[PDB]
Amino acid sequence: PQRPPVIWIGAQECTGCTESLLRATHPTVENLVLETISLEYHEVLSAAFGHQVEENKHNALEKYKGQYVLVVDGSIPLKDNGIYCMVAGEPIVDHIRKAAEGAAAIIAIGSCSAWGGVAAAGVNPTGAVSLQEVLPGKTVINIPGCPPNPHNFLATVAHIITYGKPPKLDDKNRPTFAYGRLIHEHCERRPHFDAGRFAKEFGDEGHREGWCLYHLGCKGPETYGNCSTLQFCDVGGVWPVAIGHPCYGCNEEGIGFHKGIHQLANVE
Amino acid sequence: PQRPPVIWIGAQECTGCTESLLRATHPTVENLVLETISLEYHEVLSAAFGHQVEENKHNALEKYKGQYVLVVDGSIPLKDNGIYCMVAGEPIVDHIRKAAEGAAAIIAIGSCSAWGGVAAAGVNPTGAVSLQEVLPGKTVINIPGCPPNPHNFLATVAHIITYGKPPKLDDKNRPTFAYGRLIHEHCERRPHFDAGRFAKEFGDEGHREGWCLYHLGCKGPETYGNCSTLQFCDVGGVWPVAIGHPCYGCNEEGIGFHKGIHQLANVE
Amino acid sequence: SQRITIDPVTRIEGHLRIDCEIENGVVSKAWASGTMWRGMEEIVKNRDPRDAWMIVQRICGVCTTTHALSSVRAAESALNIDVPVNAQYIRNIILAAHTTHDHIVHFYQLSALDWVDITSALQADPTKASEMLKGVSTWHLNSPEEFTKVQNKIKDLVASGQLGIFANGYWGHPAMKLPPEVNLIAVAHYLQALECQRDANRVVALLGGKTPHIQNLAVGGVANPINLDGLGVLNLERLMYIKSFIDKLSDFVEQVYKVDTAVIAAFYPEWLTRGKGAVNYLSVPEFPTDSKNGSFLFPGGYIENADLSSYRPITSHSDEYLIKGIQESAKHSWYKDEAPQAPWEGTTIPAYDGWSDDGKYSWVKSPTFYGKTVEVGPLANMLVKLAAGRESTQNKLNEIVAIYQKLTGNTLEVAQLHSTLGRIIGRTVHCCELQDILQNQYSALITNIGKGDHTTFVKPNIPATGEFKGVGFLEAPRGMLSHWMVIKDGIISNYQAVVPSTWNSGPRNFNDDVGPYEQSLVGTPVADPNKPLEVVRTIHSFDPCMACAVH
Amino acid sequence: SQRITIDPVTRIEGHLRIDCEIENGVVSKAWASGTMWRGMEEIVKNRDPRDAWMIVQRICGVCTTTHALSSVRAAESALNIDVPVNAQYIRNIILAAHTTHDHIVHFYQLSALDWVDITSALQADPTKASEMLKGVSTWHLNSPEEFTKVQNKIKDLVASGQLGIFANGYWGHPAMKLPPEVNLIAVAHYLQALECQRDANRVVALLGGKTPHIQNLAVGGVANPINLDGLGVLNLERLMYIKSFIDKLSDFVEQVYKVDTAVIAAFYPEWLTRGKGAVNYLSVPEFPTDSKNGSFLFPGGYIENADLSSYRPITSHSDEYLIKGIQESAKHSWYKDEAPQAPWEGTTIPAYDGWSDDGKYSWVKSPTFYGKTVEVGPLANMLVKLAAGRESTQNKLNEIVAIYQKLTGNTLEVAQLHSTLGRIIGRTVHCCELQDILQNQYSALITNIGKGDHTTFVKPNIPATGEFKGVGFLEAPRGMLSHWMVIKDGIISNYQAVVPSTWNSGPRNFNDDVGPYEQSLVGTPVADPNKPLEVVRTIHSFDPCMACAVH
Numbered sequence A, B: 001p002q003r004p005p006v007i008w009i010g011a012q013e014c015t016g017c018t019e020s021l022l023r024a025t026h027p028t029v030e031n032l033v034l035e036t037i038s039l040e041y042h043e044v045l046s047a048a049f050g051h052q053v054e055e056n057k058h059n060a061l062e063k064y065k066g067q068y069v070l071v072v073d074g075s076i077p078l079k080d081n082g083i084y085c086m087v088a089g090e091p092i093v094d095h096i097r098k099a100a101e102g103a104a105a106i107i108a109i110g111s112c113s114a115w116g117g118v119a120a121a122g123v124n125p126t127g128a129v130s131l132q133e134v135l136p137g138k139t140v141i142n143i144p145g146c147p148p149n150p151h152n153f154l155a156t157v158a159h160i161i162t163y164g165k166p167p168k169l170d171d172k173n174r175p176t177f178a179y180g181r182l183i184h185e186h187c188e189r190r191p192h193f194d195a196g197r198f199a200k201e202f203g204d205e206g207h208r209e210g211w212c213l214y215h216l217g218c219k220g221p222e223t224y225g226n227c228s229t230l231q232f233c234d235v236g237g238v239w240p241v242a243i244g245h246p247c248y249g250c251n252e253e254g255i256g257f258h259k260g261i262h263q264l265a266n267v268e
Numbered sequence C, D: 001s002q003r004i005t006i007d008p009v010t011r012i013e014g015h016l017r018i019d020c021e022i023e024n025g026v027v028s029k030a031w032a033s034g035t036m037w038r039g040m041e042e043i044v045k046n047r048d049p050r051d052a053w054m055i056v057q058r059i060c061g062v063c064t065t066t067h068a069l070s071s072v073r074a075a076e077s078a079l080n081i082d083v084p085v086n087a088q089y090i091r092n093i094i095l096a097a098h099t100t101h102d103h104i105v106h107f108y109q110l111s112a113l114d115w116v117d118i119t120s121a122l123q124a125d126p127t128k129a130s131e132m133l134k135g136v137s138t139w140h141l142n143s144p145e146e147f148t149k150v151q152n153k154i155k156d157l158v159a160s161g162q163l164g165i166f167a168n169g170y171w172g173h174p175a176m177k178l179p180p181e182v183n184l185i186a187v188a189h190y191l192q193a194l195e196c197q198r199d200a201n202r203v204v205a206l207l208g209g210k211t212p213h214i215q216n217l218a219v220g221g222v223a224n225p226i227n228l229d230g231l232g233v234l235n236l237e238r239l240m241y242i243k244s245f246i247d248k249l250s251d252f253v254e255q256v257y258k259v260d261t262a263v264i265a266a267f268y269p270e271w272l273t274r275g276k277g278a279v280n281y282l283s284v285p286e287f288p289t290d291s292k293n294g295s296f297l298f299p300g301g302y303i304e305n306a307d308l309s310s311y312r313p314i315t316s317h318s319d320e321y322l323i324k325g326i327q328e329s330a331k332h333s334w335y336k337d338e339a340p341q342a343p344w345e346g347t348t349i350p351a352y353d354g355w356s357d358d359g360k361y362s363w364v365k366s367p368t369f370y371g372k373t374v375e376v377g378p379l380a381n382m383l384v385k386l387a388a389g390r391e392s393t394q395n396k397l398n399e400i401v402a403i404y405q406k407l408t409g410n411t412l413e414v415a416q417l418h419s420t421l422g423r424i425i426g427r428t429v430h431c432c433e434l435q436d437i438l439q440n441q442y443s444a445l446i447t448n449i450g451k452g453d454h455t456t457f458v459k460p461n462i463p464a465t466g467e468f469k470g471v472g473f474l475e476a477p478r479g480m481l482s483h484w485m486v487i488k489d490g491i492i493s494n495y496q497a498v499v500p501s502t503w504n505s506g507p508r509n510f511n512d513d514v515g516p517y518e519q520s521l522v523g524t525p526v527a528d529p530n531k532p533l534e535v536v537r538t539i540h541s542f543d544p545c546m547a548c549a550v551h
């Protein structure tokens, strides 16, 4: 049978958001592209290049007008008329706005497209902004993280395909199944936090007993996500805190890439 | 190279403790038996039966005297002079004591052999006891659970093989890497407990948000184990509480098989 | 005659002793003995009905899930609770995936070494072995290179002098008939099977909370919280993960296990002519799909005197004819009360007095159905489905027969299924049909959640006075299972499990009639009475579970 | 003659434009252009030195880990911190496993479709394809049955009319030379590669806390808490799990990727005679194993004018000869300051003014080593190891050459390695040797923990006055990486990354000298200027990463 079409455009991306798909297991990337969707445009994997791949994009935008899911990773640079990201001689913001016109659903995968992310941090050299800022009259589904667990994205697409609508979203348009709760409000080291059992330096006795990482700078108290439950890579037990390092807040605007690793979080 | 020998004897066992090995991934059961150890006696997998398997046991007890790890699952029934478990016409306790004489290390895998478990519960029809009770002169390493995560056993064996001694044990001779902490002192639903966010019945709103299961009878507050961190089956996210059901205390003598599912735990 | 004892019978679950009298190299009489008892029925008494399932699940860890599910069904029967359909879908997925692991492990890890000679495998030509399977299987792991790697693993193990689980096996026994190449094929598949059964149990774990011993049931439904949009609960991402493992099972089941079943049969045709244990067969319907504990995907029924054409269908777990016919006797078992007992009135009073050929010789009770001995399990289950005209079962059997016919030139008739190999075939057919159960019930669950039904649990009320009775049936990997609960003043006053291996392995009954294991062994040739491989071949075909049989 | 643009170049990381003048059917001149800039060096300025690694790791998610590791090494260099040996073992395992995933994906997902025609694979005979690999590979997944399943997946995709990633590929192009059978082999391996790279990243994840973007580093060591007896930390069970994935990588790497490298060379031998980018090569030693940031398992060095016999070894990441030679220019790049700059004194002031063939045409800077253009990456890395007489590298190259010899009757000499295919070979050799790095460093970690050393982290102190300069070198999948940190008054006052794809992709330099990508294209035959497959073949051999090149 025919498969639902997807158009993926990278702006100021590091490719980590595409790379998350190569760790996925449900579906694996090969089952994603052969069984779940038709990936009609993705420059990392496309056989065609140059004029042939721009042919693919325009053919797909017309053939699937109103039907495709548009996915964007990376921030969009608006400074100096868009020239900090130019593809086929034109600003990426124009490629994105054109594709957005015919999209059935629009997804910002990763913190960069969801809220500007690292590329918009500090002095923001390129005037990087989020996908929602470039598309003010469209509902953009935000799947933040740097990069998110790929199933935060894949189960959102699956909900659209299987049930005909997006999953339920919070007030930042993030799917509640993945971003509905603070990490600290579902973290297995909360008992240690409550007892005042804290690591003070990597390698110290409490750290080597798996105690809470709050005083190392853990941003779990101010970051929404599923990192402590869904975790990463589907092997079991793998997320930054479980490995021994504080959450940095990479999911959350104003936290990741703004606060120092060892800067303390506010606790609600 | 030669592989370290293991002799496995089942007493009043349900075979769930052997079956745990069939879920293991590090090592898988095939790599366990072909690469990690030489499994010199195991009745579930043995090609030989009857007189041939009894010959295998006798030969291995002699060839490997002082060198093998003895593993026992199931409780040992002492009532009526041992007749509630008879193998080759003799009480299992006699086979166990004989094999223990030459063992380099002795492991009680599962709650039944570690402390009597379900078979010793209620009225205890058969006078079932633990492995330690039948071997008072030996240090029995206890790996409780019904059944434990297989790697609680496999990593104990690996520590013996690789480093030449057992892992560090608590005062119940349980390995600290697996049993050193209460489940409730490392449970990801502790934030909900702390906030008074509790499921009251399966399928209720709080249950369907992943709230704490204390008021459903969770025994995490009085059970030592690694179920919330190591979890089960190496797929990620899989343990009883994460699936929606309270801990029953199956690791812990006086809790599992004694307290009712919905009876509340004492909280320290 | 000569008298032999096989004790322990290995490559089963639990503790079994088989004795045989042999006349001129042929078994003339046999005794089956369960040699370990725990008293699980007594342990669970005097507790809240809701607690039973967690305790009685520990009857068995090989057939984990099954006693848990039968126990909740028994309490729901007593209490008159209708299980939510989502809870049925989840229970069904668990049971089907569990049974997939169970059957695969039985054919390979428990049974294959009765039929397969590893020493012979070392003489095989791996290229000839692969060539034998051309046009017989499309499995992707039958190359000469796969088979050479497997051969070298065996070679290295034998060379080490540490044969482990293979030590003192029946290598070169006159009843080993496979050529070297087929022995090597089977060893390669034995190792590959371990991956498939692991994937099946990943399905079980994601719904059960772990396996062995699931922890997601309740009297009243399941403990899984369905919420597509919830963090930390059974959402779409988790369901997709479940599906990813369901989809990994079919290829091995269809292109390896199903094919090997035909291959073994093709080289052992005399095993279609021995090992008949009974003339009556019972199975219960299984995999309910409605809101009232019925509408089963698999049919049940009762066959008498091998007559499929006149069998009696069973479509309900409340069938009074089924319920009223079941009794157990302890005349030849180590319990005190010997007259046949209906399980709601059953006792389990230990009375061990040692082995006697004509007296008591087993911890297993002797079940009957309206006074007859009955075989349960995959042979019964397949025969009932054939009697029902279930096209899926006939088609699946026909696929096995077609492979057998290509190898031998001969077909197989239903009469030849009343045998050791027919029993193995029925198990394979079950495993194959269970893959469609899994797809069907996963799809049903996704669809039902999409309609807005997230219900999973109906909280029971248990009257604090009165006495009332319930029975939970389940078609387990080894056959019809039933748990019988009596509640009095709110607590369990009786609990009796009648388990499929009880039916098959039980000793001579109140009328001294011979049950399936013992009957199946009459006529078995025994080439070497010190190494009675032929007896173990037939006994293994029933997939004994003695923790189950005795409890 | 005519002028063409290839924009976007696909099957790379990031945003690349390639322009070429074609005269008499051959490329006569080329321009490489990085078309996206973020200003990552400016974003990290003025922060605490300890924070840099988490920010600059986001330079790239394909070569995740690499910028994180180089950044901590740069801070450690500035601060004079000796990293604990256990932290080295962990960092090394991560880098080696990451690089295994990286190279596999490059050969298959990024590069194979330059050389492989999926339409032709539909014409293949799967049995003939499997037969072609006898005595070339022992891989267990080369059966006709595997290849038929793969062929049917392609068939179904094509039949659907939704070709997706395969649409408008260069099927039937005259430069596609593989027989149908070898195209099918390659597609089967493309799919199998995805499993091997997933296992490689499971190693990374278990130590890094996730991937992409690890989260276990620190200035001073690592965040993993080593405690064999601890719950929730890096204990023996977790180490065993890591090892289970390390062990899964070798067979695919050795039996599939290594063999396919020789197969492609055998069918495309003219590609050993074109694609030379430079006559100078640089690599840094990698995988330190002592307590003082040295004792590298892999050697480094500098080759000038292709003379291996007179190369200069580099054994230390503090080598002043290496440090003092490195400069970057922006004469032909969109930055303001154009004279060559040593990176501690570097600026990155944007000055976009559009494309000019003779002016500025890229966001990539132009690196030089003592004023010369240099190629970095797997070709450099291999050639340096051969110059050092590293037997493991010699032997691994010889294995590839031996397959090539069996397939063609011809041999390969070092002179032929200065080419598009030689570059691909160097990458395959690296991936093969990295599997021994993994085994070596896992064992070293287990052994060291057993001696009682659980140390992982030395807390840094950062003086609040003074100016401190540090450089962190790393031999990344694409070549020598260096991060250059200046600390002044406790904070980062300058941060400059000189990344391997900067060396290779950078535009014409201060002296208008041509860098490796642009040089490598001179002489490329182009059969069809509208579909310049041959140009992309050579560019892909460098494994471009433009997020890396530009940052």
Ligand code: SF4
Pocket (backbone or CB within 6 Å): A012, A013, A014, A015, A016, A017, A073, A074, A075, A109, A110, A111, A112, A113, A117, A118, A145, A146, A147, D058, D061, D212
């Ligand atoms: S969100 Fe993170 S991983 Fe994704 S493009 Fe941005 S920097 Fe890269």
Ligand code: SF4
Pocket (backbone or CB within 6 Å): A183, A184, A185, A187, A188, A189, A190, A191, A193, A211, A212, A213, A214, A218, A219, A220, A221, A241, A247
């Ligand atoms: S501060 Fe971090 S480690 Fe501690 S309980 Fe909160 S989220 Fe978990």
Ligand code: SF4
Pocket (backbone or CB within 6 Å): B012, B013, B014, B015, B016, B017, B073, B074, B075, B109, B110, B111, B112, B113, B117, B118, B145, B146, B147, C058, C061, C212
């Ligand atoms: S501990 Fe549990 S799983 Fe193990 S033998 Fe006892 S009842 Fe069975």
Ligand code: SF4
Pocket (backbone or CB within 6 Å): B183, B184, B185, B187, B188, B189, B190, B191, B193, B211, B212, B213, B214, B218, B219, B220, B221, B241, B247
């Ligand atoms: S009561 Fe149970 S679910 Fe709640 S926090 Fe404690 S261990 Fe976790």
Ligand code: FCO
Pocket (backbone or CB within 6 Å): C060, C063, C066, C067, C476, C477, C478, C479, C481, C499, C500, C501, C502, C544, C545, C548, C549
């Ligand atoms: N299958 C199974 Fe176990 C037995 N006999 C149960 O019920």
Ligand code: FCO
Pocket (backbone or CB within 6 Å): D060, D063, D066, D067, D476, D477, D478, D479, D481, D499, D500, D501, D502, D544, D545, D548, D549
């Ligand atoms: N490998 C890699 Fe990325 C590049 N070029 C870095 O460093």
Ligand code: F3S
Pocket (backbone or CB within 6 Å): A145, A146, A223, A225, A227, A239, A240, A241, A246, A247, A248, A249, A250, A251, A252
């Ligand atoms: S840094 Fe990011 S990946 Fe999760 S643990 Fe914190 S939100």
Ligand code: F3S
Pocket (backbone or CB within 6 Å): B145, B146, B223, B225, B227, B239, B240, B241, B246, B247, B248, B249, B250, B251, B252, B256
């Ligand atoms: S019931 Fe047992 S398996 Fe763990 S979650 Fe509780 S100790």
Ligand SMILES: [Cl-]
Pocket (backbone or CB within 6 Å): C226, C227, C228, C229, C449, C454
């Ligand atoms: Cl829902």
Ligand SMILES: [Mg+2]
Pocket (backbone or CB within 6 Å): C310, C311, C312
């Ligand atoms: Mg009738």
Ligand SMILES: [Mg+2]
Pocket (backbone or CB within 6 Å): C041, C365, C496, C497, C498, C499, C550, C551
């Ligand atoms: Mg009973």
Ligand SMILES: [Mg+2]
Pocket (backbone or CB within 6 Å): D457, D458, D459
């Ligand atoms: Mg210190």
Ligand SMILES: [Mg+2]
Pocket (backbone or CB within 6 Å): D041, D365, D496, D497, D498, D499, D550, D551
């Ligand atoms: Mg730079």
Ligand code: NI
Pocket (backbone or CB within 6 Å): C013, C059, C060, C061, C062, C063, C064, C545, C546, C547, C548
């Ligand atoms: Ni059983």
Ligand code: NI
Pocket (backbone or CB within 6 Å): D013, D059, D060, D061, D062, D063, D064, D545, D546, D547, D548
């Ligand atoms: Ni990169």
